Design brief:
This protein folds into 3 domains: 176 residues, Rossmann fold; 143 residues, Rossmann fold; 117 residues, no CATH class. The longest helix is centred in the first third of the chain and has 15 residues. The strands form 5 sheets. It has a 6-stranded parallel sheet, with helices on both faces. A 6-stranded parallel sheet has the order 7-14-11-8-10-9, with helices on both faces. It has 13 helices and 18 strands. It is of the alpha/beta class. Bound molecules: adenosine-5'-triphosphate, chloride ion and manganese (II) ion (2 copies). One manganese (II) ion (MN) binds next to helix 1. The PDB classes it as hydrolase.
């Protein structure tokens, strides 16, 4: 179960799961992946490539051009995102080779995908290669890089500033700044823009659209959440790292809060720092970081949400997939305890795909026997669940013509953590849906 740093053809045999852990910038995505795919084609395997984002799935369509690779938005090598793969498993192919790039991605759909894949491997039905510089259990925040990095611990602004921090804005290059949340990024970006900087903001909801702006000369800062840890390539000379994240936590099975901001894992710190130092002929890149790392605890909601997904994915007769073993200890939930019957399972999937709700919240609503289009639960919760914005209680016109206070029966802090999330949830609660 030890990671390797070189691909060999014998890794493609069934029952092998290999972790390829070359350091950041070493060429996993653009040079090792095409070598694996060529070998999979020559041995006539049924192969799927899993990219963390549609952006990366484009960086692969280019590093694989000329090969029979077919990108799938929802012989021939299949290419899709982690989320697309898990979404397809939740719907009513039998690959024998799974290649997952950026296999450190900790979103529930990626965790679930690794659990399903590693289970197929242990069943003797497939081989798999997990590519990541930071596999689970990474404890080194400062891995190798193509060019040496200047690491400096410094106080990193956590809110807008009106003076001081001259080192932030006196820089003449391009900076990638990792923030713990969209709302914190909004405040940092506005402060930078007031200083005359050209700022690009990245988050999960906006990444596929806004990342293209970074491919141009005309920007000074990218202000990004942890989504840029997943193989986002920048031409930057500096990373500023809060070393902070938010952690969704299920409190007593009752609600989801956003805990923190609190220290990132070593893997996240290494991936953030790994955005620079990538040009072997360009010394002098800087990594300015604001605190220490800490390891995830038993209570990060994403691993329990991954079990909610896997309990509802068909495997083989009555079997359910386990989590990938190095992550299976992050969850106390019993295999199968979140399995839904057929009609509630359809609602569960619809609330996630069409409703844009977090997994945990979708599960609560679906397992209560609520159908997808019935939005009464958004308004009948405890007054403690009242959603606020601008310190006034949030209100919504329902399609029935009633103006109701947003007061969901189950409280998931992710539906109201920033303006974009709240806008989406208000439209959901009103029975509307933005065109996407
Ligand atoms: N002159 C250059 N030509 C090509 N690549 C370069 C050059 N200078 C720097 N690089 C960087 O080296 C990186 C190595 O490519 P690749 O994405 O395959 O590495 P990786 O192992 O996938 O990294 P990560 O662990 O961060 O996902 C490129 O993404 C690119 O950003
Ligand atoms: Cl985000
Ligand atoms: Mn190297
Ligand atoms: Mn990569």
């Amino acid at each position: 179960e030890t990671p390797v740093e070189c691909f060999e053809p014998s890794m493609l045999k069934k029952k092998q799961l290999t972790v390829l852990d070359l350091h950041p910038g070493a060429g996993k995505t653009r040079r090792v992946l095409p070598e694996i795919v060529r070998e999979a084609i020559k041995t006539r395997l049924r192969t799927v490539i899993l990219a963390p984002t549609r952006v990366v799935a484009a960086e692969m369509e280019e590093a694989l051009r000329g090969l029979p690779v077919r990108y799938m938005t929802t012989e021939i090598v299949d290419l899709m995102c982690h989320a697309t793969f898990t979404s397809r498993l939740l719907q009513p192919p039998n690959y024998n080779l799974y290649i997952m790039d950026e296999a450190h991605f900790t979103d529930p759909s990626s965790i679930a995908a690794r659990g399903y894949i590693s289970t197929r491997v242990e069943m003797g039905e497939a081989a798999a290669i997990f590519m990541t510089a930071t596999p689970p259990g990474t404890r080194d925040a400062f891995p190798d890089s193509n060019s040496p990095i200047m690491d400096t611990e410094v106080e990193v602004p956590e809110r807008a500033w009106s003076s001081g921090f001259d080192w932030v804005t006196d820089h003449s290059g391009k900076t990638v700044w990792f923030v713990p949340s969209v709302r914190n990024g909004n405040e940092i970006a506005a402060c930078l823009t007031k200083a005359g900087k050209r700022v690009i903001q990245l988050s999960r909801k906006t990444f596929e659209t806004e990342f293209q702006k970074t491919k141009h000369q005309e920007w000074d800062f990218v202000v990004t959440t942890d989504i840029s840890e997943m193989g986002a390539n920048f031409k930057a000379d500096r990373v500023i790292d809060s070393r902070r994240c938010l952690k969704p936590v299920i409190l007593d099975g009752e609600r989801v809060i956003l805990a923190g901001p609190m220290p990132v894992t070593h893997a996240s710190a290494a991936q953030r720092r790994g955005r620079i130092g990538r040009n072997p002929n360009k010394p002098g890149d800087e990594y300015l970081y604001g605190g220490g790392c800490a390891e995830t605890d038993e209570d990060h909601a994403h691993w329990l949400e991954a079990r909610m997904l896997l309990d509802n994915i068909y495997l083989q007769d009555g079997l359910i997939a386990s989590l990938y073993r190095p992550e299976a200890d992050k969850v106390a939930a019993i295999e199968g305890e979140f399995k839904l019957r057929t009609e509630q399972r359809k609602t569960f999937v619809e609330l996630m795909k069409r409703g844009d709700l977090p997994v945990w919240l979708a599960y609560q609503v679906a397992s209560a026997g609520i159908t997808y289009t019935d939005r009464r639960w958004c308004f009948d919760g405890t007054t403690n669940n009242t959603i606020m914005e601008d310190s006034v209680p949030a209100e919504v016109w329902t399609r029935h013509g009633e103006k109701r206070v947003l007061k969901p029966r189950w409280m998931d802090a992710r539906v109201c953590s920033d303006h974009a999330a709240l806008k989406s949830f208000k439209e959901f609660a009103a029975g509307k849906r933005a065109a996407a």
